[PDB]
Amino acid sequence: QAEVTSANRIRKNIENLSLGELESLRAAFLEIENDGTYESIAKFHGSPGLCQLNGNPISCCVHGMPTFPHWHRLYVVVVENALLKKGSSVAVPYWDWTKRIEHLPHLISDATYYNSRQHHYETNPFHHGKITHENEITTRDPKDSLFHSDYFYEQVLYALEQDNFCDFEIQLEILHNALHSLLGGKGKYSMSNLDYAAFDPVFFLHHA
Amino acid sequence: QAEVTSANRIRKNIENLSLGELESLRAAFLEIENDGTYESIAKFHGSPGLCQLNGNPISCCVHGMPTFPHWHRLYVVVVENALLKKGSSVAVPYWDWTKRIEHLPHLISDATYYNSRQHHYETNPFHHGKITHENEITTRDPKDSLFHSDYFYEQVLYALEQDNFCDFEIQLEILHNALHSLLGGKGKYSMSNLDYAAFDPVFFLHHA
Numbered sequence: 001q002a003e004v005t006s007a008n009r010i011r012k013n014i015e016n017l018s019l020g021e022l023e024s025l026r027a028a029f030l031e032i033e034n035d036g037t038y039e040s041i042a043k044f045h046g047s048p049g050l051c052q053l054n055g056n057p058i059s060c061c062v063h064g065m066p067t068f069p070h071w072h073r074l075y076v077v078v079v080e081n082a083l084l085k086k087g088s089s090v091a092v093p094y095w096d097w098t099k100r101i102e103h104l105p106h107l108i109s110d111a112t113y114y115n116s117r118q119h120h121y122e123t124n125p126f127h128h129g130k131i132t133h134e135n136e137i138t139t140r141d142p143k144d145s146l147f148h149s150d151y152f153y154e155q156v157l158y159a160l161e162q163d164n165f166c167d168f169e170i171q172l173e174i175l176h177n178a179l180h181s182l183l184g185g186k187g188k189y190s191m192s193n194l195d196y197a198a199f200d201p202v203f204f205l206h207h208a
Numbered sequence: 209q210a211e212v213t214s215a216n217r218i219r220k221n222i223e224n225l226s227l228g229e230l231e232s233l234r235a236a237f238l239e240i241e242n243d244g245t246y247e248s249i250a251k252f253h254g255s256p257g258l259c260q261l262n263g264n265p266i267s268c269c270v271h272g273m274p275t276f277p278h279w280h281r282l283y284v285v286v287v288e289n290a291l292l293k294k295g296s297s298v299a300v301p302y303w304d305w306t307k308r309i310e311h312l313p314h315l316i317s318d319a320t321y322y323n324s325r326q327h328h329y330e331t332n333p334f335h336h337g338k339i340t341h342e343n344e345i346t347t348r349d350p351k352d353s354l355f356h357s358d359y360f361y362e363q364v365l366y367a368l369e370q371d372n373f374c375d376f377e378i379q380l381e382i383l384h385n386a387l388h389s390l391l392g393g394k395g396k397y398s399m400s401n402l403d404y405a406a407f408d409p410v411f412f413l414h415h416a
């Protein structure tokens with residue numbers, strides 16, 4: 001089905017990104033962080049709960065629902081579009097979690113980006129973000145740096161096996177959560193939390 | 209010569225430190241950072257130049273002089289004493305650079321310390337410090353994470369060979385500088401700089 005392939009933008013694995021590609025990304029995200037969209041965009045996922053603008057709030061993301069992949073799919077494009085506005089040359093990269101990784105990706109990991117072209121020292125926007133409403137810094141605590149296994153693959157693979165979409169989604173969603181808990185770990189403000197997770201930039205890569 | 213061994217405090221390799229020992233250290237440093245001593249103590253090494261309180265300033269540390277090991281030796285105890293005031297149970301640990309290290313020490317490396325006993329999320333004071341006078345954050349850029357070699361050993365070993373103290377010092381000082389450049393790298397505010405280096409907490413461990 002032709003519908004899956006895109007003409008316009010390409011999303012590549014994070015490792016694949018060239019220095020130039022990454023450089024656009026570093027900048028775009030930093031600018032997005034500066035711009036209004038980044039904080040507000042984060043809100044969509046969870047806190048602050050936007051779903052009911054007025055009245056009791058609820059987290060917006062559909063989870064535990066078959067709608068779930070669609071929602072997140074839309075979410076990623078939202079950020080992607082923001083990045084493009086930012087001037088990102090390429091689509092949000094995806095961190096292939098299934099593939100066993102010797103180490104965490106350099107792009108996310110780097111605390112600071114030298115960006116030699118313009119002498120400047122700045123934190124890597126990819127590395128983290130802050131949570132404006134709840135004044136804090138997002139944190140990550142991979143308890144298990146250990147992940148090197150078929151386990152991700154088995155879970156995903158099993159999901160792949162199902163013909164039924166709904167059967168597929170339930171399995172698919174579960175594997176999806178593994179990255180969140182694994183990266184976030186204990187940290188209250190992290191990937192591990194429903195509300196907080198949107199803040200971390202890894203979120204975008206993982207969802208991609 | 210009995211003069212070398214101490215009765216009172218013990219300095220151990222960083223790896224050796226027990227979780228309890230490290231915990232005291234994490235706290236003590238954090239408190240020292242909070243206290244007045246930490247920033248001021250840093251000043252002794254370099255900027256701001258304290259040597260001439262009034263008049264043209266010069267960096268205080270003796271370098272390129274035979275006095276050099278003595279000066280730094282005094283410097284470490286100064287911080288150590290501060291730590292004890294802080295309530296540190298043990299002396300400043302030493303990061304045996306000569307030994308080839310698979311990875312950088314966990315104590316220094318950790319960005320944040322969970323410190324489960326008291327639920328709190330804080331940066332690791334060991335990880336870094338800020339430079340108050342020149343508003344900035346210290347940075348580290350090990351260009352070469354590569355260091356796994358006899359090279360450190362050869363240099364130090366050669367130094368060991370000399371009977372003459374002065375002959376010894378020149379060789380000794382040079383090997384000493386390797387850690388500074390290697391950790392600091394390109395970063396303007398880092399171990400690599402004479403003025404800035406004091407700020408990084410690694411400085412203490414290395415000098416130890």
Ligand code: CUO
Binds near residue numbers: 063072207
């Ligand atoms: O699910 Cu809402 O975050 Cu991956």
Ligand code: CUO
Binds near residue numbers: 253269271384405415
């Ligand atoms: O020398 Cu003054 O710093 Cu190691």
